[PDB]
Structures are given as structure tokens and as C-alpha cells.
Design a protein around this ligand. Structure first.
Ligand SMILES: *[C@@H]1O[C@H](CO)[C@@H](O[C@@H]2O[C@H](CO)[C@@H](O[C@@H]3O[C@H](CO[C@H]4O[C@H](CO)[C@@H](O)[C@H](O)[C@@H]4O[C@@H]4O[C@H](CO)[C@@H](O[C@@H]5O[C@H](CO)[C@H](O)[C@H](O)[C@H]5O)[C@H](O)[C@H]4NC(C)=O)[C@@H](O)[C@H](O[C@H]4O[C@H](CO[C@H]5O[C@H](CO)[C@@H](O)[C@H](O)[C@@H]5O)[C@@H](O)[C@H](O)[C@@H]4O)[C@@H]3O)[C@H](O)[C@H]2NC(C)=O)[C@H](O)[C@H]1NC(C)=O
Ligand SMILES: *[C@@H]1O[C@H](CO)[C@@H](O[C@@H]2O[C@H](CO)[C@@H](O[C@@H]3O[C@H](CO[C@H]4O[C@H](CO)[C@@H](O)[C@H](O[C@H]5O[C@H](CO)[C@@H](O)[C@H](O)[C@@H]5O)[C@@H]4O)[C@@H](O)[C@H](O[C@H]4O[C@H](CO)[C@@H](O)[C@H](O)[C@@H]4O[C@@H]4O[C@H](CO)[C@@H](O[C@@H]5O[C@H](CO)[C@H](O)[C@H](O)[C@H]5O)[C@H](O)[C@H]4NC(C)=O)[C@@H]3O)[C@H](O)[C@H]2NC(C)=O)[C@H](O)[C@H]1NC(C)=O
Lengths: 129, 110, 248, 129
């Protein structure tokens, strides 16, 4: 079955970057965008941004534009995400998920899914003093 | 339907070779000429000992041979041996597309 | 359905992208005649039939123009002037189960080979030169059908392949079925390229007194070229003449 | 290997009616006509008649056309016989056997086998008071 092997837990002092990873497994990795989402403990699981494994292409919510970056070591079938700064409010607990994807028809092609199928277990990052 | 003529039991053959007649009427043996012979040992269902009038199925010892037309058919046995003896029932294909069978005869090795 | 009494289904008054079929991986055999598959979507058809049945794998070679044999002689046959398409795919996952599934039957004896597209459901007993067989079966008087069995262990050449033939005629209007395309506003008097559910050409299109009777759906000149037509969006009579030309 | 499995022993008082079954296995059911044959103990073992799995319909002799019926459950690879009477003479062993069949052979097709190759063990009807 498709699975995401999310990286381990991390700790960092405030004001130093941190970098989680997600080993896409059991599926055609280039078939789907990778979405990151996050949840401070007991708050809205509302973080959003994504990377296209076919591309260097990414997007982030405005609150993170210039504050987070994503990469993919495609032959290793991993996506990485680095939070550039570790604000003391980040209190991180982050997930990776198999998102939007092409899914071309038998007929003409389109950007099918617009939907998140499956989620990794995610990792806590405890970003505070 | 009338059964096919068949004498009672083999004799004069304590081993060796002897033949059982199956003298049927024209609308069976003289017509389509597909006569067959089957041996019915005690209880067990009978084996297809001769397929068409002259010839053997697979797994039949090369001693048994069917025979004749003009007169109605007969089976000729050979090398009769104390395991082979049983009762042999002739069967024939009739005009009306049903078969008809003989009354049987009983083997009698010494 | 069985190939004995193969099932015709008419397809009418509709639109379809044909390619939605063959771009899927499942359709193991596919061959069209008198038309090219990738371009089917551009055409429109007087009428369409999908003829559907199951036959043993090595028999599918016989569902073609001209070729003949024990299936094509007696169960279903296609004309020499055929146009249309033949499709078949493996069905040993479906119409087959451990003991064999004898529901599928085919005719194996007939007094004469079929005419094309003949369906003959007759179960009547086949007498090979007998006196009147009374309806019993026997010495030289046979029931005409046999079953296939199709047990799953059976060798793949004999496993069942489901077949569909599409038959359709490309003669011009009316046309109950078309391949999809969107369509234009009309223009008249100026020189244009045109089509009409087919009927491709060029000319100037003019309103005309040409008194088409209500049933007539395209019209031809004494030169046998299409010379007037009815707009299939509005039933107006449009009279064609080619654009001005000559020697310079 | 090819075999027939006739149903078990049965009983029926006089003037009742009775039915027996013959499943077939290791075999192709529609290849061959099902014959039946039987007799009382020490009788002629000479009953005759048949049913066609390809077709239904039947043929059975002048002493019985009106006294027996035969059925098939082809998906269950099984044939049945019923006697609509319980004559005191009808007792003991009834056998089912593979019989006539098609043997199409190159160009020609025809009926081929005319000798009942293989027989079930049969069953005893015990048809008397
Ligand atoms: C080398 O090459 C040679 C060729 O050059 C190959 O030789 C041939 O191979 C084929 C296939 O392997 C063999 O075919 C088998 O034939 C039998 C039937 O045989 C007919 O002819 C026999 C005499 O020659 C006769 O004994 C048979 O009974 C039968 O006669 C026909 O049918 C009936 C009954 O006899 C009768 O007609 C009656 O006539 C009346 C009118 O008067 C009505 O018409 C009635 O309705 C009708 O009953 C006639 O005698 C005659 N018909 C006519 C019209 O005259 C088939 O049964 C058999 O099909 C079965 O088997 C297929 C598989 O074959 C294997 O199993 C069979 C046993 O089942 C075994 O015999 C065979 O060797 C093989 O082991 C199976 O697929 C079928 O479903 C079916 O179950 C075959 O069709 C052929 O016998 C053989 N040549 C000769 C001379 O035998 C050879 O194979 C090559 N060598 C290799 C490969 O090593
Ligand atoms: C006989 O039986 C056969 C089997 O039962 C049957 O088959 C059909 O075959 C169909 C295709 O041939 C298939 O339906 C399509 O499949 C598309 C692709 O799916 C294939 O690929 C993916 C990825 O590899 C597989 O996951 C998928 O698996 C499924 O099918 C296989 C067999 O192929 C099975 O084994 C498996 O178990 C699964 O069942 C398959 O292999 C899908 O993309 C498609 O969904 C679209 O269309 C649906 C119908 O309209 C619609 O409901 C969906 O929502 C989706 O719609 C499109 O997607 C976007 C969201 O709507 C939208 O994008 C945006 O649109 C904007 C509009 O302005 C703008 O354009 C944006 O830019 C654009 O991104 C698209 O526009 C939407 N389309 C449209 C037109 O708007 C659908 O599933 C079907 O599943 C399969 N059957 C089965 C049981 O699997 C065969 O067809 C029949 N016979 C006949 C004659 O039909």
C-alpha cells in the first residue's frame, strides 16, 4: 500500500532552522504533489503549502513565503521541508501528505485530484527554549 | 423392448478361448452395427470391454476380440484366467436411437 | 449473450467519444475497417449497431471481412463490403468458473452457411440425409448446438473472449449519431469552408427557393456534387455554389 | 480423472415415485449424453434410455415413455432421473453412465462415441413394501 515514512522527532532552540523529511513509499512518487500541513498542539491543523515532485515548483501561504522551503531528492523518493527560522511560537507538529496530482483520463489530460489522500504520521519538533 | 439373445454360461474353456454369442435382430446388429460388450463383476459397475464391433478400448487385455455381422455379433475370449471370469453383457444400438442390452452370460473357469 | 443468438443492440440519437473505449488497457484486440479509429470522432452515422457475443479465443480471427470457418459459417458473419470495427477481450475472469460454466452455446451444424448479419435462433434438429427424423436425435440426425464449457484451467487459446462489433454506415444525412464537436454560428453569401455532420466542402452558402420536400436532408446536382443541404441546427435550406475561380 | 458420483441409497413404498441424482466430475459435462441403466438383482441389467446435456429432451424405451423423466442442472454439472411409479419390480441398482457424444474431427463434425465408457456406482432403490 501507499505510505509516507515521515522522519523522526527533532528539537531546536528558537531562531535556528529545522528540516523534516518524508520518504514517499509504495506509489509513483511523481504522480502526486506533496503537501505539508501542521498542527500546534490542540490548535487548527491548518498549515498549507506544497511542492511538485515533477518540478522545483512550490507554493506557501503568505505567512511562510520566505520562511519555509521544500525540496525533493527524487531518486531517493524523499521530499524535504526546512522551516527557515523556528519562531518560538512554531511548537511544531508537522505532517506530509500525498496531495493533488495529474491523474490523466483515458481521455484528455487534467490536474485531477485537488484532494489529499493519505498522511504520514508526522513529527513533533518542540521548537522552543 | 426385447432383450438380445445370449446363452447362459461359458463351458468347455477351463482356461484358453471360447466365445459368447449375442444374436440380435436386424434392426439392431444388422442395422447400424455398433455392438459392444461390457463385463459386470459382482456389484461393481461394468467395464466397457469392447467399443465397436471388432475392437478394444484402452486398458483392455489383448485377448478379448468382438466379431461378426451377417449373423449377429459375438465376443471371442482368449487366455481365460481365474481373475477374468465374471458375467458379460452384450449391448447394441437399435433403430429407434435407444440401445438394447443382452441378458448376460456367466463365465466358468475351472 | 451466446454467439448463437448474438445480441444486437441499436445505438441511436446520441453522441459519443469513441476513444473513451480504446485508450483503456483492457481491450486486447481491436481492428476497424473502412475508417481509422483515431479519427472516428470526426464522423456521423446513419445508424449504429453493437453486436455482442462470447466466443472461444482462437475463433476471434473469424470475426473479420471475408475470412470464414466453423464459427463464421454458422453463427455470425460480416459482409465483404463491411465498414465498422471489431473488438474483443479476454473474459476468463468473468464467464468462467471452476466446474466450467456451460451457459454459453454455439451452433455447429447448419444446412447452409449464413447470409451476412443473419441471426437464426432455430433449435430445430439437423438431419444429414435421413428419412424424417421425428424429432429424436441419433444415428445421423443431430442436435445442432454444442457448449464451450470454459473451465478456468482450460488452455488460454480456448478461454472465452467477449466480442463486440460496431457496425455503422457513413452515408450522409440524416445521422442519429455523431462524434462530438462544438459548433459555429452560420454565415451566408461570403465564401466559406463548411461541414454538415460530415458533408465537408467549400463554397458560398445562399438562401434559396430550392423546394426541398420535408424529408430530404441533403441534395445533389446533375453533376452529382452536393449542391444544396439543410442546416442541421435550424432546418434552413442552404444552396451551395463554389467560390469564384478561373484562369488568369 | 473422469468420474460419476450417483446419489445414495433410497426407499419408497409401492405406488410412490422416486428420484435419483448423478453428479459428474473431472469431466466435461456437455461432451456426452447421459445414459441410465439398471436392473433388479440377477435380472438382465439391461434398462436403457438417455438425456442430452446440450439440449435437454430425452429418449427412453417403449416400456417407459410415459413412466420416467430426466433433468439436468448444468451449472451444477448434474443429471437427475425420476420414475413416476413404484412398481414392485422396479427395485435395486440404477447406474448413470457417460454415453453418446460429439467427436468433431478435422473438417467433419458428427456423433462419435456409441459405447457407455464410464459408470457410477449407482444406488439401490429398495422399491417395495
Ligand atoms: C500425425 O499426423 C496424423 C495426420 O497425418 C495425425 O493423425 C490423426 O490425429 C487426429 C488428432 O490427433 C486423430 O483424430 C481423432 O479421430 C477420432 C475419431 O476417429 C474417427 O475415425 C476412426 C477411423 O479412422 C474411427 O475409429 C472413429 O470412430 C471415427 O470415425 C468417424 O466417426 C464415426 C464414429 O466412428 C463414424 O461416423 C458415423 O457415420 C454415420 C453415417 O454412416 C453418421 O455420420 C454418424 O453420425 C457417425 O457416427 C465414422 O467411422 C467416422 N465418421 C465419418 C463421417 O465417416 C476423434 O474421436 C478424435 O477426437 C477426440 O479426441 C480429440 C483428441 O485426440 C486425442 O484423443 C483421442 C481420443 O479422444 C485419440 O483417439 C487421439 O489419438 C488423441 O489421443 C479431442 O480433441 C476431441 O474433442 C475428441 O474428444 C480425433 O479427432 C486421428 O485419429 C489421427 N489419424 C488417424 C488415422 O487416426 C496424428 O495425430 C499425427 N501424429 C502425432 C501428432 O503424433
Ligand atoms: C466498462 O467498465 C470499465 C470498468 O468498470 C469502465 O472503465 C472505466 O474507465 C474510465 C476511464 O476509461 C474510469 O473513469 C475515469 O478515470 C479517470 C482516470 O482514472 C484512471 O487513472 C487513475 C490513475 O492511474 C486510476 O486511479 C483510475 O482507477 C480507476 O479505474 C481503474 C480502471 O481504469 C480501476 O482498476 C480502479 O479500481 C479505479 O476504479 C483509472 O485507472 C478519472 O480521472 C475519472 O475521474 C474524473 O471523471 C469523473 C467522471 O466525469 C469525475 O467524477 C471525476 O470527478 C473526475 O473529473 C475530472 O477531474 C477534475 C475534478 O472534477 C476536473 O479537473 C479540473 O476541471 C476544471 C474544469 O474547468 C479545469 O479544467 C481544471 O483544469 C481541471 O483540472 C476534471 O475536469 C474532471 N473532468 C471533467 C470532464 O470535468 C474517471 O474515474 C473508470 O473509473 C473506469 N471504471 C472503473 C470501475 O474503474 C469502462 O469505462 C466501462 N465502459 C464504458 C464504455 O464506459
Amino acid at each position: 500500500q501507499v505510505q509516507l515514512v515521515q522522519s523522526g522527532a527533532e528539537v531546536k532552540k528558537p531562531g535556528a532552522s529545522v528540516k523534516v523529511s518524508c520518504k514517499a513509499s509504495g506509489y509513483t512518487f511523481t504522480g502526486y504533489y506533496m503537501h505539508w500541513v501542521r498542527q500546534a498542539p490542540g490548535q487548527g491543523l491548518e498549515w498549507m503549502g506544497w511542492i511538485n515532485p515533477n518540478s522545483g515548483g512550490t507554493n506557501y501561504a503568505q505567512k511562510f513565503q520566505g520562511r519555509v522551503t521544500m525540496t525533493r531528492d527524487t531518486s531517493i523518493t524523499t521530499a524535504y521541508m526546512e522551516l527557515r527560522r523556528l519562531r518560538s511560537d512554531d511548537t511544531a507538529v508537522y505532517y506530509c501528505a500525498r496531495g493533488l496530482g495529474v491523474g490523466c483520463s483515458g481521455g484528455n489530460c487534467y490536474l485531477d485530484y485537488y484532494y489529499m489522500d493519505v498522511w504520514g504520521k508526522g513529527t513533533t519538533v518542540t521548537v522552543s527554549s | 423392448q426385447s432383450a438380445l439373445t445370449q446363452p447362459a454360461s461359458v463351458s468347455g474353456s477351463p482356461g484358453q478361448s471360447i466365445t459368447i454369442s449375442c444374436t440380435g435382430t436386424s434392426s439392431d446388429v444388422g442395422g447400424y452395427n455398433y455392438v459392444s460388450w461390457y463385463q459386470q463383476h459382482p456389484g461393481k459397475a461394468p467395464k466397457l470391454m469392447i467399443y465397436d464391433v471388432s475392437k478394444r478400448p484402452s486398458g483392455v487385455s489383448n485377448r478379448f476380440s468382438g466379431s461378426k455381422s451377417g449373423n449377429t455379433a459375438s465376443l471371442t475370449i482368449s487366455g481365460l484366467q481365474a481373475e477374468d471370469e465374471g458375467d458379460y453383457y452384450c449391448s447394441s444400438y437399435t433403430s429407434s436411437s435407444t440401445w438394447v442390452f443382452g441378458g448376460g452370460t456367466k463365465l466358468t473357469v475351472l | 449473450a451466446s454467439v448463437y443468438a448474438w445480441n444486437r443492440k441499436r445505438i441511436s440519437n446520441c453522441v459519443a467519444d469513441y476513444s473513451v473505449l480504446y485508450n483503456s488497457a483492457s481491450f486486447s484486440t481491436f481492428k476497424c475497417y473502412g475508417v481509422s479509429p483515431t479519427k472516428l470522432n470526426d464522423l456521423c452515422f446513419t445508424n449504429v449497431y453493437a453486436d455482442s457475443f462470447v466466443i472461444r479465443g482462437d475463433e476471434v480471427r473469424q470475426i473479420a471481412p471475408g475470412q470464414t470457418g466453423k464459427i463464421a459459417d454458422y453463427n455470425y458473419k460480416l459482409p465483404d463490403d463491411f465498414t465498422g470495427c471489431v473488438i474483443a477481450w479476454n473474459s476468463n475472469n468473468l464467464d468462467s468458473k471452476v466446474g466450467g460454466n456451460y451457459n454459453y452455446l454455439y451452433r455447429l451444424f447448419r444446412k447452409s452457411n449464413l447470409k451476412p448479419f443473419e441471426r437464426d435462433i432455430s433449435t430445430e434438429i439437423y438431419q444429414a440425409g435421413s428419412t424424417p427424423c421425428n424429432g429424436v436425435e441419433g444415428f445421423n440426425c443431430y442436435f445442432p448446438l454444442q457448449s464451450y464449457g470454459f473451465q478456468p484451467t482450460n488452455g488460454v487459446g480456448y478461454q472465452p473472449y467477449r466480442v463486440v462489433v460496431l457496425s455503422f454506415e457513413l452515408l450522409h444525412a440524416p445521422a442519429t449519431v455523431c462524434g462530438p464537436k462544438k459548433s459555429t454560428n452560420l454565415v451566408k453569401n461570403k465564401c466559406v469552408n463548411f461541414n454538415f455532420n460530415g458533408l465537408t466542402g467549400t463554397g458560398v452558402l445562399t438562401e434559396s427557393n430550392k423546394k426541398f420536400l420535408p424529408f430530404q436532408q441533403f441534395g445533389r446536382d446533375i453533376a452529382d456534387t452536393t449542391d444544396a443541404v439543410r442546416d442541421p441546427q435550424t432546418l434552413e435550406i442552404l444552396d451551395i455554389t463554389p467560390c469564384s475561380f478561373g484562369g488568369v
